[PDB]
Amino acid sequence: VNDLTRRTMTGVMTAMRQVKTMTPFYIQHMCPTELSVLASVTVTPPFQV
Amino acid sequence: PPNRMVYPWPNQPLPRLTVAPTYDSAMSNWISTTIAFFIRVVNSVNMTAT
């Protein structure tokens, strides 16, 4: 792989790692609440293992 | 106090002879240091990776 492209690839990968996305926070703190509430609403209760 | 005014920058009395651009005024100093800082920012590792 020519280094110019190689330099580009590590660059774009770095950019992805720097995006200030909200999803990871939502998974850890907010999504569980939504599940906990909706569990009482669906016609079929949750079934886990 | 009466007959006085405040001023955000340092000030001097009016010059005597012809004017010319200078480089020791407060604003000029503020400009130079600001530029110097950002240049340092651009060369920081964070920029180099991308």
User: In the PDB record, what is the listed experimental method?
Assistant: cryo-EM
Distance CA A36, CA A46 (A): 10
The DSSP secondary-structure symbol of B3 reads T
In this structure, the dihedral spanned by the alpha carbons of residues B28, B34, B38 and B40, taken in order and rounded to 10 degrees, is: 90
- Which tokens hold the place of B27? 């604003």
Q: Which residues of B touch A11 (CB under 8 A)?
A: 49-50
- Rounded to a whole number, what is the distance in Å from the CA of A6 to chain B's nearest CA? 12
* Interface list for B 30-49 with A (CB within 8 A): 49
Distance CA A34, CA A41 (A): 11
Burial letters A1-39, b for 16+ CB under 10 A, else e: eeeeeeeeeeeeeeeeeeeeeeeeeeeeeeeeeeeeeee
Q: Which residues of B touch A18 (CB under 8 A)?
A: 50
In Å, what resolution does this model reach? Answer: 3.3
- Which tokens hold the place of B21? 């651009």
Distance CA A32, CA A37 (A): 9
